[PDB]
Design a protein around this ligand. Structure first.
Ligand SMILES: CC(=O)N[C@@H]1[C@@H](O)[C@H](O[C@@H]2O[C@H](CO)[C@H](O)[C@H](O[C@]3(C(=O)O)C[C@H](O)[C@@H](NC(C)=O)[C@H]([C@H](O)[C@H](O)CO)O3)[C@H]2O)[C@@H](CO)O[C@H]1O
Ligand SMILES: CC(=O)N[C@@H]1[C@@H](O)[C@H](O[C@@H]2O[C@H](CO)[C@H](O)[C@H](O[C@]3(C(=O)O)C[C@H](O)[C@@H](NC(C)=O)[C@H]([C@H](O)[C@H](O)CO)O3)[C@H]2O)[C@@H](CO)O[C@H]1O
Ligand SMILES: CC(=O)N[C@@H]1[C@@H](O)[C@H](O[C@@H]2O[C@H](CO)[C@H](O)[C@H](O[C@]3(C(=O)O)C[C@H](O)[C@@H](NC(C)=O)[C@H]([C@H](O)[C@H](O)CO)O3)[C@H]2O)[C@@H](CO)O[C@H]1O
Lengths: 551, 551, 551
């Protein structure tokens, strides 16, 4: 039933594995958090703009423009979407090593053991002690948006999701969303003479959308004995592959036939002379077949315009880039490696004195990357040994500029392009994402492995109902109210489908393994262990350890 | 149902006896305690090491090395395993006198009448009074580990088990477990010149295990009206014998036949001359049969290496020793007598000004002990009247050292060895123990009479759920929280099977009996009685009073 | 049906995995080999002795004595018992990483596609060409001993088992067994004056056993179209644990309670003073409790007499030693680490110019090892700070000899001893073994994980039936016969039961992983890969990667 002095739920953070048959595993991940909620700093919906002129008023600083318009709401959201919420590091190891693909099934959520307290300051003076006592009749307002009427607002974008540590309490993310506003910011370079427009526009009768939680939602009122339960949500998603691909566009198909086996282990094999070699090529006018010029089934990976900034009405923004392997040439931005910034709750370490910690994720698929300094375009009719005018290298100045080269603006994407879908990032990364409502849709989102086809799981919104003092004027601009905060337990259940991997290879596969301390190896075990004072860190685990044959 | 203002359980500490048939008794022992729980001194799992260089940095002090590595947890354990929890002294007398063997059957446990209070300090100043008031919505976290996933950690090792006095409240033991770390400590003697290594190692990727209660367990949340009940656990164990054996290896079999009965009560009987005596001996080349040299069915008891310190990766440790009778020669360590150190809650007396009280338990089986100064080895071919070179005594210096003798290093254990299983120690001693997970297992554990064959009874873990103030930063290193403590009642039911003893002897058997005060006899009654100020002591009762025929 | 020109079997070397339910896996390993058989070098049973006087005629060389007596038989045995026959390296990785325990179920064997050819030398002269042609009517003799009447003779002892490479043909091991003979070899040291007896004895009417394959067995005759199939054999065995134990005798039980948590990550925690500490110890006369001297449930591991040579009638031999961890002190022989010697067929590399390759296997269980220089025995009554006469160290000269110390002769094994069962060695190691027919049996065999309780799987014996020329005299001492050899396919199916491991730990477990070439790390991948000329090596894989809680 429930009431004062009776718990409305239980605490389960453990993860379970059922083996359903041959190779198939049902993974059930329970997660529970104690959540700390503060009375909102304003009772009102606010429409606020951040316009930073100090940064953008001076030339060439375009890329740091923050200017936008947002609706601030008194509500806060409980957002469970990150991988670090659901699993402990060893679970991720076990899944990553043993399973060929995995998929989302269902999601459950609960709120229980609501506690609301009021704060009074007794013994006013140098002592200034605070007294804490229960308000048994106070309520917490809870709303779930199942129909996704409100703007969809993943909390992991700002790393505001529930913490990754079962035994540490966590806080909600305050709910907010963008509002339509036009921005004009002119494009300049460093120390350029002129004037930067740097203006924002008036509200648009066309594009204005102001949503209210109270008008769009059914709000449940939870006192202490109350509990709230979301129904079971079911994902419709495609499974993601947990094995990386090594196999480049030059590894596809049948190798050339060697003339004979080499005599010693140090010797190299030889091939039929390229003039006499059989094969298929799209080069005209030459009788040759070379491993580089032979036709392949598809383009694996593609060149992407990198550090591309395009401007629509809202302002400049960087065009996303499909994550691919940074090659031996290490260039990160061409291949669009992800870079995370996160706090102690989600990562970092309590030993760290910095405000945030940063990690650059490199794609684990060694096939589709591009190494730009070694890319080139050659003139037609094709020739062996091109001269300087017959080949375009990455050392060539585009539009007479020293640091701009054709690979900056070059886009090779086309019908023949094939690339792997990027990989989940265990402690910090977005599990699922809502699909855009546009008619023509992207083939993949960049940050999130799973995209909900029809309807995303709802956003769970909470706030404290206001406690009013004895004096309340509805027409007053300032509102006096009782200082109040609350805590509650969030529990959720995430079910996944996965399948065990085969091993057909003679040789041992790569695995995620712990390593002794004292060597600086990334997997050195002490990083997953507590310290003497209880400091702990949770760092990104490599994913997709095991290789796969593409073709 | 339960709620605020309704008790969720009852208090039964009394012990019951059912007589089920011929000689068979079902013993049901109820025990109840009020338990006092403090908010944990840290919210974090901590990995801490104690390395005492002051003791081990100087030579010959090896035996006092404390160095290890442990995981400190915020959780506390309620541990009912000691004999002093379950029985009052007269119950132990009654069982020990009348019963030939006894065995464990089942165990139940309950938690009820949870009370949680918060502490505030009013009237700040010289008065500095504390105010106590109920937090009705606060919860206590409870976890039972049935599957024994967590490291198994008997609280009686440190004497941290629940107190032995029904009317006195008791406290939990904080839960902690060892963590893998390597230690190097060199071996030295007193005033030896050199350097002692005395180092500890870095964490091991191989051996590191860090467990979390939240990740491995299902935690129940208990408010005031809530109660928790363990299911019934069932022991699989072998019964233990409650009668001692007197019968030495020289008492086995048929005595020699006397020539004639003696003439007076003071006279001694005589035997057939050893040269003419019939018998069986393993001595070669002599025609004799003596009571000492005649063959016996088995070796009763065996010589043990004593004060043996062996070193694996973790450090030096003393090898355990099967408890046996300290003989007329009184030597304790050769026969491995147990020595307990315990506090007022478990023993001692509230009249005592010492921090702890100490008792040395001597084995009650008078057969299998070894008296070392009278042990010797004799050369082959055997001879009567050996000279100094033909016999090895315990006065002989081994490796040219004054205080080391062969009985230190000598191990006689073999296929013919038979010894009694040691005995339970009533007020302070471990009732049951979990079996090691190794493949080749010890025949008995040294401290505990009962060893659980398959799965030990679960460990019962508790903590207070954190109470947070109005200001909580998840990323802050320091955590401010409301001062909170709680109390609850622990109740348990331990069922035992026992069988009454026969008496076939003409003469009266030895019994455990009280004795008048004024003589210093160990059983003097005032030790079991309260004092004027209420001080009470509970001291070890001898066990296995009644003799038994071995063969 | 079968006949000339029809194959009687198929080639399956692949390994299969069925998932039967929760955590349970049925592993089916097929293995197939082409076997090359030569006409035996003698048609007779021969009783031969090797007596090497050159080695043992001179003092101190006792340990190299090879002297024995054997029955040489014309038969050869096909022996499938090694782990390297059944699995490819990645299969062993997969099993070793993911499975907590494993057990033998059944064994099948087949012989098919028998080919027998005769050799004639045409064009006698400098050319001396050999001609090969089929003898269609020739037969191969096949016998399986199900009842184990013949002496049991594992071929892996000499590393004569079928090769580890599916695509490489292999040869049988010629069948032979020991014959009873007495040897006298006196014990001497280097450059000792005297005479060494070094004799062997005459045949014993008591102990002589001469077995014949033809008299004890039913032999099947296989021509080309014939095939042979063993029935299904079923093992009765205990499963073996695939997880190592780290937990030393000093890691057992509850750690001491620290006074307070340390202030900084560099600080060490402190414990209650040993004089005031509660606990249980077997030391008498001291009021202390130390981590080294506190009582533990059992002895984990034990000291073993090492390089112990005992002599029965047959000669000197080294006493086996239970494999245990070689500690930080690295001493191998005290802990009995295994050392293998093997050829290219079973290992090594075809790049190697040495005749054999050698590997020393160190036990993977980090608990039960002994580090001998740090072991010591201390005098009674116990004292802190012993002087030189009060402690026996490993630097102390035993019997006045420089290099002999008490740990050489010291045996701590007893009732309290517990140790792990050693681990399987993947490429080279014996899977199963027959149990000795003695009444009192060893608790484990040293080399083989699995011991057959009742009846071992039969030995499969083969030979070519003799081809006789036109001239045959039964009474002639020399036998002229047609040069003949044969080939056949051996196929076998080994079924195993295994169970997946749980992971309850927060931190990542250690795993077997491949590693990039260019670092000298043991797991560097190129060792599992072919070379340019086709050379390949198969090296021992570490086993039991994942840690386990002992207690
Ligand atoms: C090209 C050049 O001149 N220098 C580069 C250098 O920029 C690059 O990274 C630097 O070098 C250090 C090497 O110890 C780190 O890699 C630093 O990166 C940090 C970061 O991104 O801020 C530090 C941070 O602490 C790290 N993360 C954690 C959880 O500790 C991350 C992390 O290692 C990476 O993100 C991995 O993806 O890196 C940065 O100052 C180095 C890279 O080796 O190469 C030089 O040539
Ligand atoms: C050999 C020698 O030089 N002297 C020994 C002496 O060590 C030994 O014990 C001492 O003598 C007194 C006699 O009154 C006690 O036996 C002391 O032992 C204590 C102990 O272990 O600390 C005192 C303690 O108070 C006692 N326990 C309780 C509950 O009161 C225990 C207890 O009596 C024993 O453990 C019984 O097992 O003993 C100690 O100072 C004596 C023993 O008689 O013999 C001398 O020769
Ligand atoms: C104590 C001392 O004076 N020297 C030891 C030394 O004996 C010991 O081993 C030697 O050092 C080399 C180091 O490269 C090898 O370990 C050699 O061992 C061999 C062997 O057993 O013959 C060589 C062999 O090729 C190796 N096996 C394979 C398959 O390649 C094996 C193998 O590495 C081991 O058996 C592993 O168990 O070793 C030997 O000459 C070294 C060990 O590091 O330590 C010195 O201190």
């Amino acid at each position: 039933g429930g009431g004062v002095g009776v718990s409305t739920g239980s605490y389960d953070n453990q993860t379970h594995y059922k083996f359903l048959g041959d190779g198939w595993v049902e993974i059930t991940a329970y997660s529970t958090r104690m959540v700390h909620l503060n009375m909102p700093k304003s009772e009102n919906y606010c429409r606020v703009r951040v316009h930073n002129t100090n940064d953008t008023g001076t030339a060439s600083h375009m890329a740091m423009d923050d200017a936008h318009e947002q609706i601030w709401t008194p509500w806060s959201l409980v957002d469970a979407n990150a991988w670090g919420v659901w699993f402990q590091p060893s679970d991720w190891q076990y899944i990553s090593n043993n399973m060929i693909h995995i998929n989302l099934h269902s999601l459950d959520q609960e709120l229980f053991n609501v506690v609301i307290k009021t704060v009074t300051e007794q013994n006013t003076g140098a002592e200034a002690i605070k007294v804490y006592n229960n308000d048994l009749t106070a309520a917490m307002m809870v709303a779930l948006d199942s129909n996704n009427i409100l703007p969809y607002t993943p909390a992991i974008d700002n790393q505001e999701t529930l913490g990754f540590y079962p035994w540490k309490p966590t806080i909600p993310s305050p709910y907010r969303y963008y509002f339509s506003c036009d921005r004009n910011l002119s494009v300049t370079y460093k120390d350029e003479a002129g004037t930067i427009t740097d203006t924002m526009g008036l509200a648009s009768g066309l594009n204005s959308q102001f949503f209210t939680i109270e008008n769009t939602q059914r709000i449940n009122l939870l006192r202490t004995g109350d509990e709230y339960a979301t129904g079971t949500y079911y994902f419709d998603t495609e499974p993601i592959r947990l094995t990386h691909t090594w196999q480049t566009n030059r590894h596809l198909g049948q190798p050339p036939q060697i003339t004979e086996l080499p005599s010693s282990d140090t010797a190299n094999a030889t091939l039929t002379a390229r003039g006499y070699r059989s094969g298929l090529t799209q080069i005209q006018g030459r009788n040759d077949v070379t491993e580089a010029t032979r036709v392949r089934p598809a383009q694996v990976g593609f060149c992407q315009p990198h550090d591309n900034f395009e401007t629509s009405r809202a302002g400049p923004f960087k065009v996303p880039v499909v994550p691919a392997d940074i090659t031996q040439g290490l260039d990160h931005d061409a291949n669009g490696s992800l870079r995370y910034t996160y706090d102690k709750q989600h990562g970092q370490s309590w030993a760290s004195q910095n405000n945030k910690d940063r990690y650059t994720w490199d794609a684990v698929n060694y096939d589709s990357g591009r190494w730009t300094n070694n890319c080139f375009i050659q003139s037609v009719p094709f020739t062996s040994e091109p001269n300087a005018n017959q080949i375009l290298t990455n050392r060539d100045n585009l539009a007479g500029k020293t640091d701009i080269h054709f690979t900056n603006a070059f886009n090779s994407y086309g019908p023949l392009t094939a690339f792997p879908h990027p990989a989940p990032i265990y402690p910090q990364g977005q599990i699922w994402d809502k699909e855009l409502d546009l008619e023509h849709k992207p083939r993949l989102h960049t940050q999130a492995p799973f995209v909900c086809k029809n309807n995303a799981p709802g956003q769970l919104l909470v706030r404290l109902a206001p406690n009013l003092t004895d004096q309340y004027d509805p027409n007053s601009s300032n509102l006096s109210r009782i200082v109040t905060y609350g805590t509650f337990f969030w529990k959720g259940k995430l079910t996944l489908k996965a399948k065990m991997r085969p091993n057909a290879t003679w040789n041992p596969v790569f695995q995620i393994s712990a390593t002794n301390q004292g060597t600086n190896d990334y997997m050195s075990i002490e990083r997953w262990l507590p310290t003497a004072t209880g400091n702990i860190t949770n760092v990104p685990l490599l994913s997709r350890p095991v290789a796969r044959n593409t073709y």
